[PDB]
């Protein structure tokens with residue numbers, strides 16, 4: 079993550095603003111539809127369209143991403159509890175993080191045309207990969 | 218990584234000793250034989266068995282790995298020039314680093330049976346992945 | 357394997373795709389986001405900056421070709437393996453392109469479609485297009501199997 | 502595809518493989534080195550430490566089964582796709598195992614063979630065994646293609 083990547087990511091996620099929870103819920107819905115194997119991690123969830131459980135989980139994921147943006151230089155320390163969850167208790171396969179990152183990028187592209195330039199796309203991809211490897215670093 | 222990973226990697230690579238260049242050359246030979254597509258990065262190289270060019274390149278890679286072990290907590294700064302090389306000039310596909318890491322693990326397993334315990338294997342895998350992602354960081 | 361409704365949605369969205377810019381945009385974004393792929397395109401001239409990549413007429417001309425190949429695959433969704441036999445030969449035996457790059461380019465194309473179509477690129481449409489791009493990548497990577 | 506020299510070398514090395522411990526060692530090392538794979542084996546008991554993993558009778562028995570399946574695939578090198586049809590169905594449509602784990606387990610098995618045979622595991626023999634494990638993983642991941 080170059081400083082240019084950090085500069086690009088902060089502004090792009092700043093223009094996300096109060097739509098973060100909706101974007102996270104939409105990314106979760108996109109991941110569940112495109113990759114149904116990811117649904118096995120949520121057996122207790124109601125995963126239909128418009129689900130309030132999916133809405134709340136999307137808000138949580140979006141808030142975690144906002145915290146990661148605010149703590150980009152200290153992400154491993156800022157995401158220690160989430161890494162503990164996802165690696166020890168959940169032990170999610172790391173390919174699922176790539177799938178969710180792709181769905182987040184698709185949601186951002188479909189909601190922020192002007193912001194989703196190629197350079198911002200590259201920076202967001204690198205930031206999401208860094209978040210994913212932090213969340214899987216406990217393995 | 219973890220403190221336990223760092224200790225295991227340090228002990229295992231210390232047990233390599235003066236066979237580092239031979240092990241690097243053998244890992245390069247194994248990579249060229251098992252994955253011939255990696256040979257396209259060395260078109261000016263004599264890549265036959267027993268090649269002195271392969272011997273020298275293996276010595277260089279082994280010395281780089283020794284430096285990375287000596288600087289395990291400052292690997293991104295210690296490997297800045299190598300990452301610059303591999304990412305800007307060479308543009309190596311990242312999959313190739315996984316292939317070379319696997320061949321290094323195979324060489325270590327075939328030469329150090331007592332040292333290659335499952336925990337040491339996991340630590341070496343993590344260390345080689347960290348080295349690979351440092352060397353592909355500039356992308 | 358796409359259901360008839362997925363096929364109808366995919367062919368309805370593809371009919372409104374600008375065939376002169378979408379492929380070039382996808383190829384340029386692939387080069388920018390995964391710049392090790394630039395190793396396969398040194399004969400395309402300047403690729404130092406994202407602006408130079410997206411302004412490259414060779415990248416635009418090649419992207420047009422790749423989008424045409426994707427359209428050909430879309431017209432033959434049940435014979436993707438036979439549709440991409442010669443392209444698979446070219447990409448594996450001649451160019452030595454790793455098959456993970458095919459998946460990367462397919463996801464970049466999905467992102468480009470989302471960027472261009474906005475809210476009408478619904479999650480079901482995206483799921484159908486993910487099926488399509490996965491099939492195309494699998495057909496192109498067959499010579500490695 | 503393996504040349505006759507590669508087939509002879511692979512068969513000669515596999516004839517000396519101890520079928521009671523090699524599969525268990527490979528499965529245990531897969532669990533230790535890629536601990537997310539422990540999610541598929543939560544009914545095997547204690548997997549909290551590497552020693553507990555390598556000392557698990559359930560892991561040993563399942564590794565015996567997996568090594569038997571590998572031997573079955575090795576006895577039919579030209580019909581790997583039909584040899585692994587039911588196992589592919591089980592692993593894909595019933596267990597939902599991501600196909601990258603197949604390649605991971607194959608590489609772990611290659612490492613275990615190198616560990617056991619030392620200098621006997623020459624680079625040509627390793628190249629032949631990499632071909633074999635790649636074929637096995639491809640055959641097992643057919644249901645996803």
Ligand code: HEM
Pocket residue numbers: 116119120138139140142143160163164168170174175178209210213
């Ligand atoms: C950027 C990627 C991700 C972020 C930021 C993220 C964030 C979070 C957060 C904030 C929570 C709630 C923690 C709490 O309430 O204490 C959570 C839980 C969870 N996550 Fe993720 N996550 C990510 C990726 C994934 C992926 C890819 C999967 C599976 C495919 C996954 C599966 C789960 C599950 C199953 C839970 C538990 C939910 C529940 O039990 O109610 N996560 N994650």
Ligand code: HEM
Pocket residue numbers: 255258259277278281282299302303307309313314317318348349352
């Ligand atoms: C384990 C990770 C690796 C390490 C530690 C490593 C280390 C090195 C070193 C020390 C050099 C010599 C630089 C110098 O002369 O100062 C080098 C050069 C090079 N490496 Fe790597 N390397 C790694 C992985 C790879 C991979 C995976 C490839 C591609 C298959 C690759 C391709 C090259 C090439 C093409 C050169 C230039 C050779 C020449 O012109 O002399 N490296 N690497």
Ligand code: HEM
Pocket residue numbers: 393396397421422425426443447451453457458459461462492493496
């Ligand atoms: C994933 C779907 C892809 C499709 C449908 C596709 C399609 C094509 C087509 C139609 C051509 C021109 C063939 C001709 O003119 O005879 C071509 C050539 C080429 N492709 Fe792709 N491509 C794909 C992926 C990739 C990727 C990911 C890379 C590199 C990372 C790549 C690298 C190249 C190169 C360098 C050429 C030039 C070959 C030459 O000039 O002889 N392709 N591809």
Ligand code: HEM
Pocket residue numbers: 538541542566567570571588591592596598602603604606607637638641
């Ligand atoms: C890569 C080559 C592999 C081979 C040849 C193989 C072989 C087998 C065999 C022979 C069985 C027993 C089937 C039966 O008794 O009917 C089995 C079951 C199973 N496999 Fe694998 N396996 C492979 C990879 C994997 C991987 C990588 C995982 C997980 C990460 C996995 C997870 C399982 C599980 C959980 C079962 C038990 C499920 C059941 O018996 O219903 N396998 N496999």
